[PDB]
């Protein structure tokens, strides 16, 4: 046994910090979500499964406004998300505050990779065992990634939790970077059916959206979902076959 | 300086004068009086410029911020009573503005009047704001019916500020008028509304 | 484990914070708590159970006023749930001080979320050992249950403490989304009855409610206790014979 | 600018003027210049509408507290020494205001006046504080009985600062009585109020 | 077990704490102090035995004074009683200043046992280790146990110290809720006698009490123990011959 | 002192006077007043020497900073706002400038004027800010059109200032004019701005 | 044994600081970043390789414009990177601020290390595992090296991160301070390309310089980039035909 | 007290005046009024004598610092640039000085003046802050000229303060002029200055 | 046999503090630095070699100006060298500033025999790793000698580093007080190659010195260094045949 994750202030001895490497699998063990990102705008896709029936249907949520046109999903303790997401909100609206510009895909990533660096320098403070998926359309559609470590990194399409791995090997066939908004939106509708392996039923599931055109986030109604859901469940159910 | 407001059963009429005036020095051309804080609300402010526009971005920046935490719009009294508590932790700097919040929410339409040392209060009825507020009062409690379109209440208001002006040099034109239909957040703008008191002229 | 868990700040390899599962097994060492959600309003019953006679049974209760139509129960330490609460109790207060508008009971959710988890995340200082479960109808009903982290998860039937387990099997099979608030109010007595293995006598038990209708707070005394609890007793006894 | 305030025998009686004004804007004189402060509890202020609702807040956020936090209704006493400490913290802006908090609890009835800077002193059944307050004891201290009730005490409050209101020269129109005898909190505006003087004066 | 027992911030497997176990363990160590309620007043006694006669024969002080109605008395370590009734002091003149009432039982007892938690919280501060039996009447007699973990407990008869047990099982089959004042007084004297296993004298206990009917606390001399002193004996004498 | 902006069909044209009369006193004739803040974004001062170029010094520092860090160029509104921020937050050191910030960003052309007291409002196409404003408006709408060239406003601007300087008895005889055409940002300069108006006889 | 390693305020029996030594070693796991110096200018070749196609191949960026005249590349985690070069762009401009002159390159890249400096001495944090390569031309080219110990070191050629060991051994012989610009960038790749141990292609590297008739940061576009790396390719396949 | 200060084509020369009065005493007797800042780096003040001999200290000290640190003289421009920073934070104690700091560095020969607020400033001619600036500007520009050689600097420098001699009450005869030439840190001081002012005679 | 050079709030049982004794070892593995002092002048020279071929003659290049007349070289880590250096210069100002005084030779020793003891006592912060020769000429030439833990001694000539031992033992028989400037740059030289077992060519040490006729610091130049090379190697030549 190690000693090289009893703090975050241990180096082991091959040059890495162990204990960010388990904040790492704090996101796995959480439940999946899927950022799609197409040429007409972003997409973002999350468990609401969760738990029997006891729990409410429509359980609130793993789809955060950050604001009326950057929207983030996260994965991993959802309450190392909650404070976050909380962190996330003031941190847009302080750019908008001194800048009367909307933050950028890009810079909101870059503020929420520093704030989780400096819980991760200090043995004071454990850092979030926690990752975030930022989706936007600031002019140029975009997803991205944060890190529980608060590394950034940019992403075509990208997932995490439970599903992680089958969705990436899902989209490194069929994902193409000319997908209109509809096929990107219907193809990680599939990928998520696979992600808990089940039918895809519309009260499970949360999907909101960033368009290009308009640069609003909006959320997709149950029974609005329901057509783009049923066209997945053909692909879902024949990849279950086997 | 003038700020007016009127609760009509179709919509919130608020207006302002964009052009104001020391008394006889302007440096305003195109100067900023009338904020969006939503589709439903807006803020209307009487008083110094500069202190106004400072105050209206804080107040703008937590109005989305706090749609966004309780899943649920603010209502107008909301938003109201945010600058009231901000005017009073800042005044411990030099910020002095008389203010004129209204819009739309869910419990009907609403106007409340701030003063800068804090206070929110509901009026259903006339409401009027700065140094023609005096002149501006007695041409609008009389004209009120509360039974008026959102279409004959930007009449009464421009006639009001009207009427201010010429007996202020402290106010110009400029005349703003909003209209927050329930639909949409109209704003008139200088150029027309100067057309309509035109022809209040000859 | 055997030295990653001996700190709030330690993941594992399997990356668990086993100190806030842990200050969990604390709910279940306190005794049963009970919330269901109906759409007529929302139910709150609590264990007001004295072990020894010498009690004054008074404070042995969970129900907490919060605002004057969110109460609020609670599982845990004694101590950390008071000090808790009272920070709930302010935090409503402050809530309408600068906004002139009673607290949305999700809002006070998200709050009281985010107070355990600076607690949670500092190392110098221990999560509270406590969950929460809010219970109020700001327009419409609400249930939600708080972890010891400042985790949320929405409920339509819920229980914290020791009978939870027993109590999450009891709503699978009965609890119905189309119970009336008096029909509710007997099946959550003989969830309590279940739980507590026996029969219930109303000095044992303390009930407190919202209901949209009236949109306010009321406590049950003794005297209007009763009625239901009589209905209550007949099936607690059956249900001892299953 | 003034206030009177009176115990019945079966409650708590108070009265305000309605009408402030700052320069040529009208704050209230249609619109809440009295607070709430719990259901069984009123405060009434003489002094300006910003200062008075933003404290009147406070007042009212630490009265729903005491009640919550200890499960016992509070006394007139204890949020009466809670607005003194208060008024103790902000003393560096103009927070000087003339307060009547009273209402009723387990010892009886009970109505404190604070002074402006601190303290909190109390009277037996007759107070006033204001600017009127002279003109207000002859009326109040005249026609009180140890036998009066609530219904005559409503219009004896009305007629001390209607009184008052000719030696003043600052109080105008309007003028808005609480009645708290335990029963009802109601306030009962100008227009009750007008119709009652309607005799009392014509 | 290990390393469940070295540090405050910790929890065990069960949710049970031990260091905070051995706090309780602390209240155990200590000499009795029982304290009985009744209808006409709260009586509070406490032991004062000394293990020598070098010891002064009014030994400071086994029945503290907090307010004028308003008394606690101590087992456990008697170091932190002085630090933690000077709290408890302050506390109701406290109240005095920002009410201008006295402060209820109750709610002193709740803020006395938040300190306690206050220092529960903290990693490098450990809690009083001390329970204290605060009675007094607000408007009806209250007597509460104060306990090292923070948590009150409302008591219709109650103990504490070394003889806390013997004396649960005792006023089980003894105490009714029908004494008068004086046959409240001498039943609590025969608990006293019960548990050290001798005689009293009016130089082995402190006894003061609390009437509704003065609203104050008065502190009772050696000359006026001895009618009760002599009453109480007989009973001592034949529960000390079975 | 005076400050005008107006905005051509391909560029943005601001002025400043570049000596700085006050009383007899002059501090020097090749002074600056002038600041380049980015590429083809300028800042240009009205108000006092010493408090312009102070606060000058961090507003080019933000700018690269922020430019840097998104890997995108700040418009016009992102430095205005920021101005105006560090204005109102300065009130213990506060500055007594008039600012007028713009330039060609990637929303257009459009310049802002920031109060000495904060707040950024916008001029549509004409602004001119100073003691020289109210003359200097009407001679920059005589030949104003928004297809007016560079070449032409350039010339415009001149006139506006160059009756600013010779009506007071405290305004210096210099002048800098500041061309911003997206392909050059040229900075004309006291000498090639005299002879510009030295067919204007003064 | 060995260590004495798991604080950073301890020095071992070597005298080493083994957390610094672990540190070093992070630094590699990051990905490799050629510097490379000659009297023309200063070239800077960085690894903008990471992921398969679940990732774009755009990925920010790496090879960060710190100041107007200084770049920097990074090797060791992205993560570590965010934050030292957060204040890195502030200490730049900080310069400028107080001065209104240049920053210098050896200037810069002391308190770059110095900020690190602070977390080797002080026993509350780690140090960043993270050795960023500083390349600018104040007034004469400089290539330096600051190190997550703190070291700064100037180099003339060199690399670090995955192919520092590698890289050494191949400008033992090419490296030479009679190169031309050209023949120094497609050193440089040449150098990158043996690290990787694969064939180029411009799309996923990125090359930028200060140039000394410059004296600002400029960067290669990958339009430009295609015929560098393809002679680059040619050397690339000598190497691996031996 | 005034300063000029002049760029000679080779070097730079500035001056200074003496023989001043603060309180009720000469306060220049053996004064120093130009302090050697770095090794060919000079300041030269206008004002509050002790201010600027204790700012004087400081910026010596960090100049050294500079030169130490980074083995690289200091450029005046950064000296200055720091000077602004500090008089920013000195608005809370006395120190109001008017300062130019020049001499040379690896940009060339230049002088930034500093104002009282703060705020560095280029200029590559001449320069003079004061009180007798205007009449200095006069004399200064007369035969003032790029190719001004710094033995022909020093006759034009003490030809101002001899104008503003009879225009103040702080100057006298013998004065401070320095020459900075990079090969030469040189300074007159008072006897050879009476000879250099007996070549006009007067 | 110990476990306290895990601390340095502690003493081991011989009273010594091997943490420091290990700081002291980090001295030791880092390249040496020597003085002379002389009576006609102090002479500080230090080596100049490191790393490869690649890395820059000027690559550190130890004997920073502190003052006018006071150059101070190096020896262990680089990292905390600078800071170190940083902190000499900064004091050596303050005398400056607060006096006029430039500051002694022997007085800016104590007072970083100061600076470096607050590291030393402070538990949450570490002791430097780093020895420094402090040296000038005040108004007579001195050398002294700062610890790792700041221990002021005064040397007549002293090396520190790896080169220490050899260099000491040479001096015990060559080293004169009747030494002159000329013999003794010689003599140093003759030292620093005892040291490195090899020649030494120019640039590949730097030599600072302080002169008692200019009473200010002048760098040795390559040039003025070129003659002491070749005389020193005389006897370096015949030290180094076996």
Known sequence: QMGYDRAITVFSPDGRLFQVEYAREAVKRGATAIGIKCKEGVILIADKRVGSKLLEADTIEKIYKIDEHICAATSGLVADARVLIDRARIEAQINRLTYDEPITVKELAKKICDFKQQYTQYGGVRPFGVSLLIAGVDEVPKLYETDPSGALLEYKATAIGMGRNAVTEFFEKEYRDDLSFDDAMVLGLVAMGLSIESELVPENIEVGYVKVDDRTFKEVSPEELKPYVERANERIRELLKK | ?202
């Not at chain 2, 300086?1 to 004068?17: H, I, Q, S, Y």
């Not at chain 2, 008026?148 to 703003?176: P, Q, T």
Request: charged share 25%.
């Open chain 2, 1 to 202: 300086t003038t700020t007016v407001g009127l609760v009509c059963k179709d919509g919130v009429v608020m207006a302002t004068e964009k052009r104001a005036t020391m008394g006889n020095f302007i440096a305003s051309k195109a100067a900023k009086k009338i904020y969006q804080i939503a589709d439903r609300m807006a803020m209307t402010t009487a008083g110094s410029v500069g202190d106004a526009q400072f105050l209206a971005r804080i107040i703008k920046i937590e109005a989305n911020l706090y749609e966004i935490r309780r899943e649920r719009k603010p209502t107008v009294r909301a938003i109201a009573t945010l600058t009231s508590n901000l005017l009073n932790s800042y005044r411990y700097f030099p910020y002095l503005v008389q203010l004129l919040i209204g819009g739309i929410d869910s419990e009907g339409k609403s106007i409340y009047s701030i003063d800068p040392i804090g206070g929110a209060i509901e009026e259903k009825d006339i409401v009027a704001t700065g140094s023609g507020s005096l002149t501006a009062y007695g041409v609008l409690e009389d004209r009120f019916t509360p039974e008026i379109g959102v279409d004959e209440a930007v009449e009464l208001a421009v006639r009001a500020i009207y009427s201010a002006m010429k007996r202020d040099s402290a106010s110009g034109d400029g005349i703003d008028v909003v209209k927050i239909t329930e639909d949409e957040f109209y704003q008139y703008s200088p150029e027309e509304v100067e057309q309509i008191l035109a022809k209040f002229r000859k």
